[PDB]
Design a protein around this ligand. Structure first.
Ligand code: NA
Ligand code: NA
Ligand code: NA
Ligand code: NA
Lengths: 197, 197
């Protein structure tokens, strides 16, 4: 019977989406495990890797750990339908992430709106960015996992393609193989790997 | 005509709720202002006060700055309706905050569920806590500002009273008075103060 504590570190948006779904199943199966969750940037979580049994991050694989690819996100440029004719003049909401990923977003904007990229609003979290969009602050690109409960009546969703290939963002589960001896950690890793497949 | 950059630091949950609503009005009135937003714990935002023109935090007033009281939140204990008879056995989801506030939550639980407080799941962000609740992970107390789009069909909401007085959490806007000379900062402060009234 599985006991003890599990300490999970994850990308901020993962704490709002995938991790809650998985922990609902995990706790139901393994009720005696104490669960600790810290969220932050992928950079922050990677830096504090020693504090976590398991990490769920986005972008590239984590150095010197076992990595399991969970899924990829497509992306959508999102803007209000009532302002379609004025999309080039609406403020763009940028979130913080690694340069390779953000530069893809900037390049897409430059190429497709036919003008220099400029972010009027900059936020750290994708979740913050999502709420700025919803409240009418401006336009943005979001990963598909963050598009739940955005009004299809109010907003147009344009799939973000670069040379007819989708812009994608990967999500990885990472951990030190020596944590798998802990049944709470093994049970989580096995459940996560099963959930996505 | 108002120009320049404004740097806002706020409580994580404020970035998901109040700040998006206010920035939608702010940008519409003052389109040439560049907006920078960082979210975090009240403790983190207070520590990095020098990085922000204006701060929106929760709990007590910020030391050695001008403070404007924005609003108070009531609180609700939230649990799934299908498990009403088993509420005492369901895992409690705790979020991180200052001890005075968290101890009020713990005391309420101890008094009203008639057993020792124990958090099976601990998260840093209230927003994370909300999604854990929604996904069926367990039970929790949330501030009223964070209760939008939680299913009334699925969940019971019990107002959190302590001696027939509501458990409350205050929100404050803080800034160094010498930032008000900047028209972008003055315009924001005046708008926020007006919005809540
Ligand atoms: Na980010
Ligand atoms: Na974006
Ligand atoms: Na918190
Ligand atoms: Na709580």
């Amino acid at each position: 019977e599985v006991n003890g504590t599990i300490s999970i570190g994850c990308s901020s948006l993962i704490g709002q989406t995938l991790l809650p779904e998985v922990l609902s199943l995990y706790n139901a199966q393994f009720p005696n495990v104490e669960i600790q969750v810290q969220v932050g940037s992928t950079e922050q979580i990677k830096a504090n890797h020693r504090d976590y049994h398991v990490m769920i991050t986005r972008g590239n694989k984590v150095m010197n750990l076992a990595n399991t690819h969970l899924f990829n996100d497509d992306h959508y440029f999102i803007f209000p339908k009532n302002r379609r004719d004025d999309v080039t003049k609406l403020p763009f909401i940028e979130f913080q992430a690694d340069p390779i990923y953000i530069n893809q977003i900037k390049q897409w904007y430059n190429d497709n709106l036919e003008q220099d990229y400029h972010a009027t609003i900059t936020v750290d979290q994708v979740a913050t960015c999502k709420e700025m969009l919803i409240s009418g602050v401006g336009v943005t690109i979001l990963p598909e996992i963050m598009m739940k409960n955005i009004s299809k009546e109010q907003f147009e969703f344009e799939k973000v393609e670069i040379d007819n290939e989708p812009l994608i963002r990967s999500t990885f589960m990472s951990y030190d193989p020596s944590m798998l001896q802990l049944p709470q950690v093994d049970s989580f890793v096995n459940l996560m790997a099963s959930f996505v497949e």
